[PDB]
Structures are given as structure tokens and as C-alpha cells.
């Protein structure tokens, strides 16, 4: 959904808008920064998009994008480049400008681009640079410091100086500057981090037609251009397709996969070159080329396909620079809650005006004092407190090993209700493991031998340790992980190729037949000293190998045994051998045909390779299921293995039923039909594959919501089907986490509300959340931190409300008695007592254990609002009681009403109110700070506990110790001590009452509101579906 509206240039209109906004007032600027579409409409006039010199983009977020000329008319929106293709009268993204061309076209491009034809491609595509723009500190200030909040704070600073409250004005300015500097630091540091993370400048050779080789910078590369990759291998500057040769690529830079991966030349064909399909023929930007071998030609060649932000790493960086808006609204009914507090403040302000008039204070002072009171209820430290809360959450995660690039995504961990787990690498170990070999003695399967090392030397062990296509790179074999683990299990050392006995003669590979996907098997020619004839070893699927094997050698239990193995999640391959009467020699063996070796084989044994469940997986899954979080397996693997793992890891506990949803494709003459196949070992789970998921999404849209609500295993899911599933689940108002670790989970991790990658490093761009640890234990950690962050932010906002209302009430009372709180008494209460205690309260770590109860999401809920209105009742009661109680004393002398504050100060009324309110701020900071269920107790926060104790001691000294800070703060000295003790008793009464009020609310109001009003329904579509199912199960 993209809306474009061209605005052709108009000088007179532009200058008219200029003067109007610059002269009239700042209100138009405020409403333009709120609603800038009218600003552009008045500043420039609509035009035919073929003539636009400025665009307005809506994705209903609105951006304005000028249009550059290079004749090429193009614009840049969020890094991507859109060009004006004059013929079709539309701005087409350059990403698609050459989309869909055939692999044959890519191969034909292997002669490169003529320098004359390279300028056009450069102008279209632009430089091959993922340019992170640098904003100057002045411009960072202007961006941060021009908010409406800081504008109001500057207004307040001006007012407090109008009334001569210089210390409080300095306090506001310092708090606001500290607020602005945190934002500037983090925003500038992140930009400088990305700028160097995407930094790359090589001198890459290219193949300019005519036969000459041209050396150019890394930024002069354009799609279709041809690269000459060095034999030694270095970083990859562009996102090229490998046309000739092969090269080891360490793709950890892009996807975090630590192991080298083989890239093979692109195959000639008429299909479209797809980076996701032909991902074994594509070289990505930022990955490292370890070796590059040119089997034909003097050097290896790749064809540039994507450059700049078009590259995969470019898209990953763009998703960090331009994140999609976070799904949850933190301020649920922002205007309504702020309006409740604002109507309270408005009633107070009108009361203040009425009483100031009744006190016969001049009108200018009336207006100034009313505006000061209105400013009291906008705490200068609110943005600082919120940002600091997010920073603390991020730091705690980073110390746990979890790295979130966007700290505001952390609160989405405490909103999670469903987590999708990739099976392999995330739930189960990275690669397969060998639990044994099943040799034969004639036509009978021998008992499984757990480890193949002790197998007596023979054709089976030689096949195990030799029948493979490994290549020793840097003394570390590389290739298919299955072969790696098989040969490692044999224990033999790879030194064509020879293998030495671990403890018994070395064995040589006379000839090797490379594996093929269509052949489902591979064969080799193997000889060893003392061997009369070479032995050719063949490994392949059980049925196919058995078919070529001699029938009298295959036991009748072959099919039954392999099916029994498959049922238990094992993957099985068969090993066969045949003696070749050919003389043992390198040259003679090389002429043997693949058909000769593959045919007339002997079944020697069956090899079973199991992918194991990580030790930390089952506890985490069971903890999530105990918290009533949905654990879903979204894998691209078989359904048998997926269901076996799901049962094993506790997604399907032994008592639940598992039903297979199978959707038949609507073959000729019949429509699509669902059939359900129950299994015998959230009480009903569904398991369905990728084909079934697609058929249900297309043909069965009525039944998709139920499948998604009660589906558990999603096997054989294509990488786009994972993203489709995540989006479909989010359509049900789920908050979906995706703990996929692999590279193919990229779209799912980007779509998911919380996307986590398991085995990553510090500076990873793969997904919003990346952890350094292999196990899925980082998912409970993220959920616990998210719940802690939600509770902490709710408590900080509650404190900034309680704070603000307490100061408002104190100022109202002092206006009533016709004095004010005092300049340095404002400075203390705000700079020290409240800013310290608000930035320190958000330092309390998450509770160590997940619980079934979830944090709220509504700041306007009855709990929060009742807590505020009953804390404020006790605050006002305590202050009023202390005031009315200092009148009854004998030594009391009413303040001089004729003069106005600060001329009244010091006086007993202001002193009493200041003391009580100063204690009340600390009392409220401690009261709003909760421990369990979501946070650790208050006392585990040593800085916060120490701040509370130190400030309480200082305030007790102010109340008791005479002459301590009574000059600066302008406090009146009370000679009496019984009154001081009574004041401390009243403060202790408020402390006890506030904690008792919080406890009583937390314990009773939930039950009270549940009994008082039963839920009409659950707003969540998935909860409605869960009810509709519990009343009547869908699969009957």
C-alpha cells in the first residue's frame, strides 16, 4: 500500500508558506509536525507525477521525499532507489529493474559490462555502498531538542525565571539536558556502529569486454558486472552469482553460520535466478571467501546481481535503519489517560486561580502562578526515566548474552503468547549424529553396534571411513555435515585421498563418483595395501541401495526395519560394496563407469543417523507450556521427525492427542478435501506439512483459524511459508515470537514480534534479537526481561504520575495559604529526591522464574487508576492533616499574608508541607516498586535501596537537626521536638498506609473485579477461537 502525490515546484507559493509560518506563530509549526501533509499542500501544489519535484509517501505514516536528477528522475526512500521509467509513467524500484532474467542471461553476462555501458548502470543503480548517513551533533540536537515535550520544558524554564525561581529553572534545564544527551549518545553511537559495520572498500577486478581486466573500487560495481574473485579469497563486495568455478564461503558474517559453505557455479537453465533458490550458487556481500578454485579458465568469475541496499546484507541493514513500527501501543488510550490526569490538573488549576484571586494577588501574578502550577504536572524527568528503563533492560539482556538492536522491542517479550521454534539447530543439535551401524552376516541384520570404531576391519568399516566426498581445507574437512559426522565417528584421519587407521593399514581412494541429488546416492573406488582387488563402496537411500544390492543379501526385514527406524525419528542410509576385478591402480579405476560400480552391489549394513534434542530444550519447552505460552514447531524437515521431536521436547506431552491434518490437492474432477489422521503415543494438537498449510490457506479460509489456534507441528515448511504462518498467527492477535536460528528463518524472524537467533555474536544484524548461546534458554530470558520491562515502565509512569500529583497538591495547598514551595525546595524535590529515585528504580532485574500471570497492557485499567486515586487520597490526607495539625501547636505563628512567596518563606506552613511531601516522594517510589511476580524485590536493587535510605536519613535530619540546610532551603526552625516526632509519626503512618493500600489492591481488586463483572468475552480473536473450540472440537 503505497500512495504517491507529486508536488511540482512553485516559488511564490513556497515563499508565501515560508513567510506565513515564520511570522504568524509556532502553532502552525506544531500542527505541521503533527500533521505535515497540510504543510506540504500549502507549501507546494499537486502536480502530475511525471513532473513531481517532491513526493509524499504513505505506507498511514507519511514521509516526504524530494526527487533527484542525474536524464534520470529518481528518488530515495529508506535506502531503496526508485527510478522514473518514462514509458510506463511510474517510479519503479531498481531492485526489480532486471528481475526474472534467466540463468542463461546471467551466464551470458560473464563477459562483463563495457565502461560506456557501465555509466548508465551506475546512474540507475547508484554506488555499491550501504551508506549509513551521518547526522551532525547540531542536527541531532535539533531532532531531539525540538520535541513538543522539550518545547514545553523550555516554556516552563522561561516561566520559572519570570517568577525568579532561578534554582528550579536550572534544575529543569539540567534534567532536560540529561534527557537529551542520553538520546543523542545512543542515537549517534548506533549510527556510528552501523556505519563501520557496513564499511567495505576493496579494489575488485572486473572483466571489461574486449578481454582486458579492469581494476576498480568496490563502489564502482553495478549489477550485471562481472567479478574476478581472488584465489586466496577475501570479503565479497557485492551480492554476486557464481558463474564459473567454486569457492568456500564463510557465511558467518551475514547469517552467523560459523562453518564454511561450498558455493558452486550457477547451472545453465531457463528458470529465473533466485537468490533463495540458487543460494548455493550465490555469493553474498560481507561474507568471506576462504578459497576460490577455477576448474575451467585461468580464474574464477562471479556476476554482480545486487549492490548497495539491494544486497541481502543491505536489506538486513535497512531493517535496522528503518524498522517497521512496533506492533503494540505502549500508551493504550494515551489521550484518555492523559485526559483523566489533565482534567484533574484543570480542576486544580481553576481552583488555584480562584483562591489566588481570593487572596488579592495582582492579575499578572495570578496568570504566572497558574501557568507554573500547570507546568508542575509535566515532570521534566519523564523521558529520561523511560529511556533509562529501556537502557537498563537492554544492558541486563546483554549481560545475559542476548543482544537487541531496538531496546523498545524488549517489552514485546512480556507480551508473547506463542513462540515458533525451528527444529534443527534451535531445538535439536546443529547436525546429525551416528548412534551405530547395523552390519550384516549374510542375509541377516546384526545387532546395532553403538560406535563403529570397534567394528572389525572389513569392507563395512572401510566404506564408513572412505565412502564420502570430503575435502580437507586447512586441515579441517568440509562438505555435507552427514559425511563429516560419519567419517568423524569412524575415527579415521583423511590425508586422490588416503585414510590412516586410528590404531590396520591406510586405505586409498582410487576414484570417487560425486554425489547427485537425482541419484540419491554416491559411490567410490577404494583400495588398500595387500588388497588383491579394489572394493567399491556405495552409500545411498535404503530402498535404492537395496534395489541394486543382491536380493539374496537383503534380509526380508529390510523394509520393516527401516520403517521402524524412521518412525522413531532416525534417518537411515544403506552402505553396500562390491569387489571390482579391475587391477588396483589409479588410472585403471578412473575409467570405471558409474553404472558399473552402482550396479551389482552387496548389502553390507544399514547406517542410522539421529539428530539429538539439546539438553536445554525440554526444560525450556515445559516451562513455556507451564506459563501457558504456545510452543509451535515450524520446521522445514520431515513430518515424522518433526512430530517425534515435538513429542520428545514436550510440545506434545504424552497425554495430549496429536492429529495429522492432511489436505489433498484438488485433482481433476474433485475439490480440495481435508482428512484427519490421529496418532497414538491445548489437549489437542495438530500436525501438518507445508503442502497442507498452503492448501488450507488457499482453499480452506474458514478452517485456517482453528488449524492455526491448535496447530503445533508445521513440517516441510518453505521459508516463505514460515513468514506466512507467522503473519497468519499475528492476524489472530497473537504476539508471536520466532526463535528460529537458521539463515532460512530470516523472513519469519523479521515478521515475528520477537525474532531470536541462537548461535550469534555481538554485532549481528540477522534478527532483532540475537543471542550468543546455542540453546533456546534465551527465550525464557527474553520473556522474563520483557515482563520486567513492562512492569518497570508501568511503575515508572505511575511514579511520575504520583510524583506530579503530589507536587501539584502541595503547590495548591501553599497557594491556598498564599505561599509557594520555594525555589531550592523545588530544586531538591525534583533534581535529587525524584530524578535519582526514578532513574534508580528501573534497575531491578526480572524475576528468576516465569509465571502464568501476565503483565497488564492498559495504563487506564481499574487497578492502575484506583491505585493512583487511592495513593493520592492518602498523600493529600497526610499533607492536609500535617498542616491542620501545625495550626494547633502553641508556637505556631501564621505566615505574613500581606507579602507573597518567596517573601513569606521561611514559615511554618511551607516547612511542614515540604517535609511531609519530601518524605512522600520516597514513600511512593518504594510503594510503586513491586517485586514478584515480574521483578526481583526492591532490596535486591542496592543503588535504589541505598538512595531511599540515604534520602530518608537526609530528610529525617532536615526535620530533626536544627540549622541543617534550613538556610539554603529556606525552612523555618521548629524549637519543639514533640511536634517533630509527631511529624515523623505521620510520615511513618503514610509509609505503612501506602504499602498496605498497594498490598490490599493487588490482593483484592483482581478478585473484586472478576466477581463484580464477568467478562462478556475476550477481545483476542485467538481466545474467541479457543472458546469456540472448547465448546465443540473442530476435528471430530
Task: Say what angle helices 36-43 and 11-23 make with each other, to 10 degrees.
Answer: 130
Three-state DSSP state, 470: coil
Contacts with 16 (C-beta within 8 Å, 6 or more apart), sequence order: none
Q: Which three cell numbers stand for residue 655?
A: 497425554
Q: Which of 762, 735, 738 is nearest to 750 (CA)?
A: 738
Give CB contacts under 8 A, 24+ apart, made by 452-461: 452/489, 452/490, 453/489, 453/490, 453/491, 453/502, 457/501, 457/504, 459/535, 459/537, 459/577, 459/604, 460/575, 460/577, 460/604, 460/605, 461/490
Name 216's bridge partners.
204
CA 890 – CA 617 distance, rounded (Å): 72
**Residue 196 annotated as lining a ligand binding site:** no
d(CA 699, CA 665): 9
Beta bridge partners of 404: 769
Looking up cell 472478576 gives 1010
Q: Which domains does the chain have, with CATH numbers?
A: 1-97 (no CATH), 203-321 (2.70.150.10), 344-400+789-1012 (1.20.1110.10), 411-428+614-772 (3.40.50.1000), 433-610 (3.40.1110.10)
* CA atoms within 13 Å, Cβ hemisphere of 402: 30
344-365 burial by CB neighbour count: b if 16+ within 10 A, else e?
bbeebbeebbebbeeeebeeee
The data reach a resolution, in angstroms, of: 2.9
Torsion, Cα of 15, 18, 20, 24 (10° steps): -150
Which residues fall within 8 angstroms of residue 562, CB to CB, at 6 or more apart? Answer: 542, 543, 572, 606
Report whether 650 contacts 621 (CB < 8 A).
yes
Asked whether the beta carbons of 130 and 317 are under 8 A apart, the reply is: yes
In this structure, the dihedral spanned by the alpha carbons of residues 988, 993, 995 and 1001, taken in order and rounded to 10 degrees, is 180
First to last CA, the chain: 41
| Cα-based torsion angle of the residue sequence 470, 472, 476, 481 in order, rounded to the nearest 10 degrees | -10
- Residue 131 in grid coordinates: 551508506
Handedness of CA 598, 603, 609, 610 (dihedral sign): positive
Q: What is the DSSP string of 109-126?
A: GGG---HHHHHHHHHHH-
User: Cβ distance 984 to 916 under 8 Å?
Assistant: no
753 marked as binding residue: no
Which H or E run contains 179?
helix 166-197
Q: Are 633 and 421 in contact (CB under 8 A)?
A: yes
Residue 1034 CB partners (closer than 8 Å, separation 6+) = 703, 706, 710
Query: And the C-alpha cell for 40?
Result: 506540504
Measured distance CA(430)–CA(612) in Å, rounded: 9
766 contacts 760 by C-beta, under 8 angstroms:
yes
Give CB contacts under 8 A, 24+ apart, made by 183-188: 183/144, 183/383, 183/387, 184/137, 184/140, 184/141, 184/144, 186/387, 186/391, 187/140, 187/144, 188/135, 188/137, 188/140
**Residue 562 near residue 542, CB atoms below 8 Å:** yes
113 torsion bin: left (phi>0), alpha (psi -120 to 50), beta (else): beta
List gaps in the chain by the residue before each (C–N > 2.5 Å).
59, 70, 495, 503, 681
For residues 969 and 947, give the distance between their C-alpha atoms in angstroms, rounded to a whole number: 20
Closest CA to 688 of 277, 1035, 276: 1035
521 φψ region: left (φ > 0), alpha (ψ -120 to 50), beta (else): beta
User: What is the helix (H) or strand (E) element at residue 693, kind and residue range?
Assistant: helix 690-699
- Give the residue among 852, 756, 854 at the shortest CA–CA distance from 397: 756
Neighbours of 425 (CB within 10 A): 21
515 with 479: CB under 8 angstroms? no
**Cα–Cα distance for residue pair 330/310, rounded to 1 Å:** 33
Bridge partners of 493?
500
Residues in CB range of 167: below 8 A, 6 or more apart: 823, 824, 826, 827
How would DSSP label each residue in 404-426? ESSGGGGGGTTT--EEEE-TBTT
Q: What is the 3-state secondary structure (H, E, C) of 842-902?
A: CCCCECCCCCCCCCCCCCCCHHHHHHHHHHHHHHHHHHHHHHHHHHCCCCCCCCCCCCCCC
| Active site residue ranges | 422
CA gyration radius, the chain = 36
The strand pairing partners of 573, in sequence order, are 607
Provide φ and ψ at 970, rounded to 5°: 65, 55
200 by DSSP, 3-state: which? Answer: coil
User: Please, is 893 exposed, middle or buried when counting C-beta atoms within 10 Å of its C-beta (0-12, 13-18, 19+)?
Assistant: exposed
Take residue 382 and report the three cell numbers written for it.
Answer: 519523564
Is the distance from CB of 983 to CB of 959 less than 8 angstroms?
A: yes
User: The sheet that has 80-85: what strands, in order across it?
Assistant: 68-69, 73-77, 80-85, 90-93
Half-sphere exposure (CA, 13 Å, Cβ side) for 968? 9
- Distances in whole angstroms, Cα of residue 239 to Cα of each of 242, 251, 309: 10, 12, 10
Partner residues linked to 3 by β-bridges: 58
Nearest to 241 by CA among 257, 223, 216, 256: 223
Per-residue CA distances from 565 to 172, 573, 640, 777, 863 (Å): 72, 11, 11, 30, 56
Question: Residue 831 gets which letter from DSSP?
Answer: I
Of 116, 127, 273, the closest CA to residue 198 belongs to 127
H helix runs in 742-861, sequence order: 746-751, 778-816, 823-827, 837-841
Amino acid at each position: 500500500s503505497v500512495r504517491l502525490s507529486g508536488y511540482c515546484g512553485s516559488p511564490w507559493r513556497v515563499i508565501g508558506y515560508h513567510v506565513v509560518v515564520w511570522m504568524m506563530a509556532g502553532i502552525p509549526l506544531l500542527l505541521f509536525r503533527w500533521k505535515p501533509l497540510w504543510g506540504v499542500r500549502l507549501r507546494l501544489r499537486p502536480c502530475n507525477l511525471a513532473h513531481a519535484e517532491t513526493l509524499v509517501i504513505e505506507i498511514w505514516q507519511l514521509f516526504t521525499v524530494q526527487v533527484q536528477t542525474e536524464v534520470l528522475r529518481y528518488y530515495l526512500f529508506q535506502g531503496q532507489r526508485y527510478i522514473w521509467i518514462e514509458t510506463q509513467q511510474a517510479f519503479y524500484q531498481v531492485s526489480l529493474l532486471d528481475h526474472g532474467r534467466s540463468c542463461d542471461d546471467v551466464h551470458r553476462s560473464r563477459h562483463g559490462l563495457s565502461l560506456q555501458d557501465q555509466m548508465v548502470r551506475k546512474a540507475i543503480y547508484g554506488p555499491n555502498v550501504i551508506s549509513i548517513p551521518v547526522k551532525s551533533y547540531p542536527q541531532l540536537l535539533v531532532d531531539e531538542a525540538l520535541n513538543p515535550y522539550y518545547g514545553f520544558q523550555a516554556f516552563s524554564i522561561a516561566l520559572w525565571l519570570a517568577d525568579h525561581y532561578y534554582w528550579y529553572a536550572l534544575c529543569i534545564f539540567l534534567i532536560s539536558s540529561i534527557s537529551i544527551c542520553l538520546s543523542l549518545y545512543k542515537t549517534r553511537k548506533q549510527s556510528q556502529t552501523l556505519r563501520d559495520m557496513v564499511k567495505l572498500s576493496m579494489r575488485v577486478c572486473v572483466c571489461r569486454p574486449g578481454g582486458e581486466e579492469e581494476w576498480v573500487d568496490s563502489s564502482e560495481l553495478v549489477p550485471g558486472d562481472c567479478l574476478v574473485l581472488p584465489q586466496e579469497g577475501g570479503l565479497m563486495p557485492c551480492d554476486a552469482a557464481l558463474v564459473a568455478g567454486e569457492c568456500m564461503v564463510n557465511e558467518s558474517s551475514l547469517t552467523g553460520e560459523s562453518i564454511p559453505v561450498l558455493k558452486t557455479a550457477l547451472p545453465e537453465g531457463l528458470g529465473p535466478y533466485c537468490a533463495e533458490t540458487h543460494r548455493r550458487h550465490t555469493l553474498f556481500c560481507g561474507t568471506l571467501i576462504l578459497q576460490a578454485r577455477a576448474y575451467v579458465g585461468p580464474h574464477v568469475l562471479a556476476v554482480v546481481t545486487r549492490t548497495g541496499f539491494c544486497t541481502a546484507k543491505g536489506g538486513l541493514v535497512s531493517s535496522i535503519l528503518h524498522p517497521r513500527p512496533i506492533n503494540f501501543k505502549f500508551y493504550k488510550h494515551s489521550m484518555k489517560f492523559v485526559a483523566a490526569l489533565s482534567v484533574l490538573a484543570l480542576l486544580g488549576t481553576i481552583y488555584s486561580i480562584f483562591i489566588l484571586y481570593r487572596n488579592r494577588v495582582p492579575l499578572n501574578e495570578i496568570v504566572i502562578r497558574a501557568l507554573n502550577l500547570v507546568t508542575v504536572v509535566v515532570p521534566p524527568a519523564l523521558p529520561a526515566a523511560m529511556t533509562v528503563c529501556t537502557l537498563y533492560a537492554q544492558s541486563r539482556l546483554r549481560r545475559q548474552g542476548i543482544f537487541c538492536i531496538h531496546p523498545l522491542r524488549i517489552n514485546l517479550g512480556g507480551k508473547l503468547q506463542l513462540v515458533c521454534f525451528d527444529k534443527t539447530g534451535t531445538l535439536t543439535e546443529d547436525g546429525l549424529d551416528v548412534m551405530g551401524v547395523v552390519p550384516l552376516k549374510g542375509q541377516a541384520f546384526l545387532p546395532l553396534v553403538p560406535e563403529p570404531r570397534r567394528l572389525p576391519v572389513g569392507p563395512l568399516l572401510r566404506a564408513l571411513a572412505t565412502c564420502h566426498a570430503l575435502s580437507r581445507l586447512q586441515d579441517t574437512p568440509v562438505g555435507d555435515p552427514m559425511d563429516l559426522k560419519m567419517v568423524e565417528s569412524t575415527g579415521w584421519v583423511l590425508e586422490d585421498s588416503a585414510f590412516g587407521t586410528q590404531v590396520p593399514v591406510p586405505v586409498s581412494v582410487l576414484h570417487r563418483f560425486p554425489f547427485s541429488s537425482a541419484l540419491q546416492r554416491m559411490s567410490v573406488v577404494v583400495a588398500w595395501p595387500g588388497a588383491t582387488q579394489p572394493e567399491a563402496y556405495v552409500k545411498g537411500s535404503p530402498e535404492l541401495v537395496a534395489g541394486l544390492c543382491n536380493p539374496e543379501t537383503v534380509p526380508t526385514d529390510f523394509a520393516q526395519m527401516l520403517q521402524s527406524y524412521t518412525a522413531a525419528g532416525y534417518r537411515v542410509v544403506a552402505l553396500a560394496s562390491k569387489p571390482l576385478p579391475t587391477v588396483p591402480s589409479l588410472e585403471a579405476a578412473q575409467q570405471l563407469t558409474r553404472d558399473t560400480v552402482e550396479g551389482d552391489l552387496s548389502l553390507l549394513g544399514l547406517l542410522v543417523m539421529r539428530n539429538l534434542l539439546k539438553p536445554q530444550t525440554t526444560p525450556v519447552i515445559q516451562a513455556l507450556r507451564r506459563t501457558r505460552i504456545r510452543a509451535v514447531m515450524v520446521t522445514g524437515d520431515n513430518l515424522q521427525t518433526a512430530v517425534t521431536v515435538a513429542r520428545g521436547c514436550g510440545m506434545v506431552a504424552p497425554q495430549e492427542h496429536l492429529i495429522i491434518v492432511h489436505a489433498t490437492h484438488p485433482e481433476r474432477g474433485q475439490p480440495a478435501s481435508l482428512e484427519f489422521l490421529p496418532m497414538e503415543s491445548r489437549s489437542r494438537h495438530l500436525a501438518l506439512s507445508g503442502p497442507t498449510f498452503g492448501i488450507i490457506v488457499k482453499h480452506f479460509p474458514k478452517l485456517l483459524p482453528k488449524v492455526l489456534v491448535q496447530g503445533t507441528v508445521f513440517a516441510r515448511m518453505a521459508p516463505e511459508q514460515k513468514t506466512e504462518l507467522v503473519c497468519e498467527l499475528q492476524k489472530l492477535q497473537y504476539c508471536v515470537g520466532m526463535c528460529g536460528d537458521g539463515a532460512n528463518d530470516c523472513g519469519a524472524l523479521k515478521a515475528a514480534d520477537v525474532g531470536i537467533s541462537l548461535s550469534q555474536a555481538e554485532a549481528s544484524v540477522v534478527s532483532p534479537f540475537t543471542s550468543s548461546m546455542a540453546s533456546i534458554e534465551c527465550v525464557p530470558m527474553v520473556i522474563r526481561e520483557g515482563r520486567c520491562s513492562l512492569d518497570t515502565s508501568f511503575s515508572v509512569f505511575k511514579y511520575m504520575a504520583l510524583y506530579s500529583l503530589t507536587q501539584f497538591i502541595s503547590v495548591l495547598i501553599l497557594y491556598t495559604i498564599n505561599t509557594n514551595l520555594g525555589d531550592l525546595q523545588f530544586l531538591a524535590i525534583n533534581l535529587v529526591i525524584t530524578t535519582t529515585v526514578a532513574v534508580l528504580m528501573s534497575r531491578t532485574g526480572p524475576a528468576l522464574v516465569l509465571g502464568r500471570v501476565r503483565p497488564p497492557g492498559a495504563l487506564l485499567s481499574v487497578p492502575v487508576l484506583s491505585s493512583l486515586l487511592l495513593q493520592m487520597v492518602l498523600v493529600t490526607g497526610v499533607q492536609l492533616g500535617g498542616y491542620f495539625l501545625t495550626l494547633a501547636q502553641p508556637w505556631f505563628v501564621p505566615l505574613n499574608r500581606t507579602v507573597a512567596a518567596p517573601d513569606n518563606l521561611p514559615n511554618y506552613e511551607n516547612t511542614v508541607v515540604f517535609s511531609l511531601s519530601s518524605f512522600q516522594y520516597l514513600i511512593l517510589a518504594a510503594a510503586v516498586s513491586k517485586g514478584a511476580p515480574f521483578r526481583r524485590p526492591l532490596y535486591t536493587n542496592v543503588p535504589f535501596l541505598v538512595a531511599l535510605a540515604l534520602l530518608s536519613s537526609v530528610l529525617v535530619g532536615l526535620v530533626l537537626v536544627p540549622g541543617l540546610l534550613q538556610g539554603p532551603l529556606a525552612l523555618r526552625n521548629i524549637t519543639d521536638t514533640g511536634f517533630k516526632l509527631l511529624l515523623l509519626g505521620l510520615v511513618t503512618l503514610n509509609f505503612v498506609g501506602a504499602f498496605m493500600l498497594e498490598s490490599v489492591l493487588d490482593q483484592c481488586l483482581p478478585a473484586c473485579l472478576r466477581r463484580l463483572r464477568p467478562k462478556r468475552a475476550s477481545k483476542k480473536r485467538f481466545k474467541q477461537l479457543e472458546r469456540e473450540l472448547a465448546e465443540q472440537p473442530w476435528p471430530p
